[PDB]
Amino acid sequence: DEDMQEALEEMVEADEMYARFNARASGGKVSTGDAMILARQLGLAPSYADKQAFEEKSGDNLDYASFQKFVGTSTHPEDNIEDLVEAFAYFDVSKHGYLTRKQMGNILMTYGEPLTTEEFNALAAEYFTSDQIDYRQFCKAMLEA
Amino acid sequence: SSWEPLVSVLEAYYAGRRHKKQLLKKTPFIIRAQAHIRRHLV
Amino acid sequence: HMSSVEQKAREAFKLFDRNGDGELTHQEAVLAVRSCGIPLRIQELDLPEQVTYPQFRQWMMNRVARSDPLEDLIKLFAPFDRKNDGTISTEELAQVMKTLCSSMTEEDIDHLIKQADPNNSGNIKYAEFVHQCF
Ligand SMILES: [Ca+2]
Ligand SMILES: [Cl-]
């Protein structure tokens, strides 16, 4: 409730947050889905678990203060390169450092919070150039702010 | 051995649970990757 | 009664697709089928060397349409129901698994056994136990 808030202040600048919120705010409130989009646009990476827990306890329409709380809960300060890379390296039987395009697609569209074929196809148009993919390189791209 | 068809099942069941145990440790991070992907695509 | 079948099939598939490429090797398919409670001989799985989820699911549908595999599993215990009263010896199963299971540690086996005879009675009510696991 405070490390989320400390992390918010060192991860987003409040001027930008307020500006975006009022960009899409209709009478000082935004939907939870638009809050997901705004949080992404502020540089955070909320999950759908985050979204559903937050609306489970706070409802579906957020005023600025509840939006601030939601963005706080999406800061995930514990994110780091080595953990994402170990996620992918789980499927890299030899840990040599490469996955194929078919592996990347199946992993991303089968486990966790699967991507839609559209999400994955956009991702792949950008990053899955080859058929052999250096997933540590890809994870660092994904983690750039 | 005529136990073998039985223990084969019990052992494969426990291997399924061993895989589940290891996947449970990684899927939170797969999810983090998916969330950062969705951030990137916005 | 069936969407449960496909749910268990899809989970087993995902758990044994060790390199996450969306195919099982034939051996991984053998284990994935067995892991659902389905007795299966290593040479009796009519699937190719690489197995996609559609082919896997199709085999599962044909399989569970011919007998209830849980009831065939339960029948496998019968030659060892020496008292013919619906139970086998807890120690007998503990020993058989120690002897024949290479992928299982002694801790795994003791866990399986204490979930099979929680009252430490010496006997395993195997129909009940089978429906507890599967
Ligand atoms: Ca595979
Ligand atoms: Cl998953």
Numbering used by the authors:
A (entry chain B): 67 to 211
B (entry chain C): 777 to 818
C (entry chain A): 0 to 133
Sentences from the paper on this structure:
This active process is based on the motility of the parasite, referred to as gliding, and is empowered by an actin/myosin motor. MLC1 (in P. falciparum: myosin A tail-interacting protein, MTIP) binds at the very C-terminus of MyoA, while ELC is expected to interact with the C-terminus of MyoA upstream of MLC115. We demonstrate that ELCs bind to a conserved binding site on MyoA to induce its α-helical secondary structure and stiffen the MyoA neck.
The successful formation of trimeric assemblies of MyoA with its light chain proteins allowed us to crystallize and determine the structures of the following complexes: (i) T. gondii MLC1/TgMyoA-C/TgELC1 complex at 2.4 Å resolution (hereafter named complex 1) and (ii) T. gondii MLC1/TgMyoA-C/TgELC2 complex at 2.3 Å resolution (hereafter named complex 2). Both TgELCs display a typical calmodulin fold with one N-terminal and one C-terminal lobe, with each lobe comprising two EF hands. Clear additional electron density was visible only in the first EF hand of each complex and assigned to a calcium ion coordinated in a tetragonal bipyramidal geometry. Both TgELCs form conserved polar interactions with TgMyoA, involving TgMyoA residues E787, R793, R794 and K796, a π-π stacking interaction between the conserved residue pair W779-F79 and a group of hydrophobic residues clustered around the conserved TgMyoA region P801-Y810. Additionally, in complex 2, these water molecules are further stabilized by interactions with the side chains of E27 and Q49. Mutational analysis on TgELC2 showed that disrupting one of the polar interactions or the conserved π-π stacking interaction W779-F79 has only a moderate effect on the binding affinity of TgMyoA to TgELC2 and suggests that the hydrophobic residues in the conserved MyoA region play a crucial role for complex formation. Complexes 1 and 2 are monomeric in solution, but while the calculated scattering data of complex 1 fit the experimental scattering data with a Χ2 = 1.26, the structure of complex 2 displays a higher Χ2 = 2.41, indicative of small structural differences in solution. The electron density in complex 2 reveals an additional α helix for this area, which is absent in complex 1, suggesting that residues 66–77 are disordered.
